[PDB]
Amino acid sequence: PMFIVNTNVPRASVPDGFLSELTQQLAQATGKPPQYIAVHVVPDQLMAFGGSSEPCALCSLHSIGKIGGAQNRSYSKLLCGLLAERLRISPDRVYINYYDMNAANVGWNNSTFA
Amino acid sequence: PMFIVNTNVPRASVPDGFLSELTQQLAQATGKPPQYIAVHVVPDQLMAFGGSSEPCALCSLHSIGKIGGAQNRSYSKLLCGLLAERLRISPDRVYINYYDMNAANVGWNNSTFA
Amino acid sequence: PMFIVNTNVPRASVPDGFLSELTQQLAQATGKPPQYIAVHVVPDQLMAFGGSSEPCALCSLHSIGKIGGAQNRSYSKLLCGLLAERLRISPDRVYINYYDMNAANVGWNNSTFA
Ligand SMILES: N#Cc1ccc(CNC=S)cc1
Ligand SMILES: N#Cc1ccc(CNC=S)cc1
Ligand SMILES: [Cl-]
Ligand SMILES: [Cl-]
Ligand SMILES: [Cl-]
Numbered sequence: 361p362m363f364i365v366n367t368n369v370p371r372a373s374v375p376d377g378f379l380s381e382l383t384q385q386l387a388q389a390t391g392k393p394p395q396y397i398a399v400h401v402v403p404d405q406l407m408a409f410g411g412s413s414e415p416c417a418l419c420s421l422h423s424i425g426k427i428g429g430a431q432n433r434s435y436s437k438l439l440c441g442l443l444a445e446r447l448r449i450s451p452d453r454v455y456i457n458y459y460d461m462n463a464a465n466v467g468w469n470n471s472t473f474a
Numbered sequence: 475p476m477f478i479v480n481t482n483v484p485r486a487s488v489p490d491g492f493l494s495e496l497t498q499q500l501a502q503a504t505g506k507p508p509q510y511i512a513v514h515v516v517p518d519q520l521m522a523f524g525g526s527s528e529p530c531a532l533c534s535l536h537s538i539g540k541i542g543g544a545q546n547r548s549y550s551k552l553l554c555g556l557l558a559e560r561l562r563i564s565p566d567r568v569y570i571n572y573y574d575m576n577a578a579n580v581g582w583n584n585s586t587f588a
Numbered sequence: 589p590m591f592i593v594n595t596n597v598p599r600a601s602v603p604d605g606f607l608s609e610l611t612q613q614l615a616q617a618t619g620k621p622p623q624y625i626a627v628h629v630v631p632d633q634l635m636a637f638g639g640s641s642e643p644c645a646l647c648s649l650h651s652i653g654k655i656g657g658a659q660n661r662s663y664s665k666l667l668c669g670l671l672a673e674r675l676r677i678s679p680d681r682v683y684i685n686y687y688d689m690n691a692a693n694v695g696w697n698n699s700t701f702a
Pocket of ligand 1: 361362396397398422423424473
């Protein structure tokens with residue numbers, strides 16, 4: 361699993377430990393060892409959501425499997441929950457795009473996961 | 475709809491109302507209320523197009539539906555047009571990837587759009 | 589083809605000519621003229637891989653065709669090889685997501701490639 365957050369929240373408002381917290385929580389939610397989890401946070405972005413530049417986020421979660429209707433609802437609860445608590449972003453100003461990747465379409469260590 | 479532009483144009487060359495203009499224009503082009511529209515502009519990027527670092531842009535438009543052959547041609551006219559007029563990027567140095575997202579694969583407000 | 593790299597490696601560690609090297613090597617690997625190849629490098633990111641902030645990268649390659657099992661393995665060998673040699677990122681701390689884009693879903697020069 362790879363989780364990216366792009367947000368207009370400033371860097372100083374990303375708290376210490378947020379990357380580890382994301383990593384642990386995604387491990388828990390996906391059932392995957394945290395060694396396999398990548399996270400990426402991009403603050404200070406020039407963004408609007410609904411025409412407004414109050415705090416918002418555009419995110420992606422790519423995963424080889426573990427993507428589907430109920431799982432995605434459960435990830436969205438968790439992740440919006442973290443972004444609200446840690447970054448003070450209202451859940452209704454967050455979009456998270458979920459991508460179920462084929463193993464053959466993920467490269468790693470000079471090969472792919474196929 | 476979510477529209478992201480990554481460009482090597484500098485921040486100072488992005489004009490003041492550009493995020494609202496993109497939002498209104500996308501609202502008009504997709505038939506969707508502007509409350510549902512997200513936009514993100516990433517200037518000062520290290521990029522090349524055709525091996526050259528003259529102004530260029532890599533973009534994406536994600537939408538739940540409203541994606542297809544004719545619609546995409548129409549969005550490309552509109553968006554290249556805006557990027558040419560506002561950011562002074564030649565349309566032939568712009569790529570825009572279109573993604574038709576399933577509602578179940580877009581998270582928002584602690585749940586998905588399914 | 590479009591190739592994007594996000595990495596926590598600092599901008600000063602990206603060597604001169606890296607964008608042009610990426611362009612040429614992708615041209616060679618894909619069989620596509622370098623005129624149509626876009627590359628984008630994003631350093632200084634706030635990222636973790638396996639919970640660690642040692643050097644890593646998250647990447648993507650979008651291409652209209654030229655995506656598949658053996659080709660992706662071959663692209664991964666090349667790209668991880670470059671990132672190791674030029675940016676000193678261990679191949680086992682790189683993910684590259686491959687996307688086979690439909691021509692109708694790629695915009696360019698006020699139209700699409702359909
Ligand atoms: N099976 C399997 C599998 C699933 C995910 C990954 C990479 N980790 C997150 S995308 C690597 C291997
Ligand atoms: N139906 C429907 C629908 C379409 C799009 C969105 C989010 N807005 C842009 S991606 C939310 C719901
Ligand atoms: Cl290039
Ligand atoms: Cl939509
Ligand atoms: Cl991690």
